[PDB]
Design a protein around this ligand. Structure first.
Ligand SMILES: NC(=O)c1ccc[n+]([C@@H]2O[C@H](COP(=O)([O-])OP(=O)(O)OC[C@H]3O[C@@H](n4cnc5c(N)ncnc54)[C@H](OP(=O)(O)O)[C@@H]3O)[C@@H](O)[C@H]2O)c1
Ligand SMILES: Nc1nc(=O)c2nc(CNc3ccc(C(=O)N[C@@H](CCC(=O)O)C(=O)O)cc3)cnc2[nH]1
Ligand SMILES: [Mn+2]
Ligand SMILES: [Mn+2]
Ligand SMILES: [Mn+2]
Length: 159
């Protein structure tokens, strides 16, 4: 099973200048809980944005060019990325925009955080047909001293 996980600001913005400009510790904690002990697939730009391997996860990087770091696994196609995960129950696709576009048609589950923040961005999450997806979990949180915007955690499953 393939799942996508992402945090979306207003208008589905997910990044600007190869960065995420907000800081929401509760959402990073959610990301870690839902990805720990699973393989994660990311594109090369997202790998450069994160800047280090994510511990406790098999890190698989998509790039057309040879890898430059043997602490992670480098693959050259979507099918190779999937195969490099082995026989696991759930593969997590962690972006960015181009990668989410390619894996969305193959995904059974979306873990989305909707952030109440207006962000100038240059990268968006793919337009997804709402009729295809059932909301199975949602949890709203007001802003607090640690998290400066309100946010909604949602899990959607393909109908
Ligand atoms: N808010 C969130 O949840 C979230 C999550 C992840 C990322 N982001 C943001 O998203 C942005 C990065 O997204 P992005 O769309 O620019 O880049 P991306 O999807 O991270 O990376 C694209 C790169 O991945 C490689 N790639 C993708 N598909 C491939 C394929 N089928 N075969 C081989 N290589 C493939 C290519 O690398 P080569 O050029 O080396 O071939 C391509 O240039 C940043 O702003 C980041 O902060 C946000
Ligand atoms: N919901 C969600 N939020 C994100 O921030 C996110 N980020 C990415 C890609 N970028 C990043 C950037 C940093 C870290 C990171 O530092 N993660 C630590 C945080 C642990 C914690 O704060 O408790 C990790 O071990 O996962 C992960 C992904 C992909 N999907 C996401 N999905
Ligand atoms: Mn092929
Ligand atoms: Mn197999
Ligand atoms: Mn806000």
């Amino acid at each position: 099973m393939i799942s996508l996980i992402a945090a979306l600001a207003v208008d589905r913005v997910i990044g600007m200048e190869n960065a995420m400009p907000w800081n929401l510790p509760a959402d990073l904690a959610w990301f870690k809980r839902n990805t720990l002990n699973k393989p994660v697939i990311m594109g090369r730009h997202t790998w450069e944005s994160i800047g280090r391997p994510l511990p406790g996860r098999k890190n698989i990087i998509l790039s057309s060019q040879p890898g430059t770091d043997d602490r992670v696994t480098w693959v050259k196609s979507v099918d190779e990325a999937i195969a490099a995960c082995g026989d696991v129950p759930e593969i997590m696709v962690i972006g960015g925009g181009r990668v989410y576009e390619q894996f969305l048609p193959k995904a059974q589950k979306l873990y989305l955080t909707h952030i109440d923040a207006e962000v100038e961005g240059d990268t968006h999450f793919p337009d997804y047909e709402p009729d295809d997806w059932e909301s199975v979990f949602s949890e709203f949180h007001d802003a607090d001293a640690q998290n400066s915007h309100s946010y909604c955690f949602e899990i959607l499953e393909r109908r």
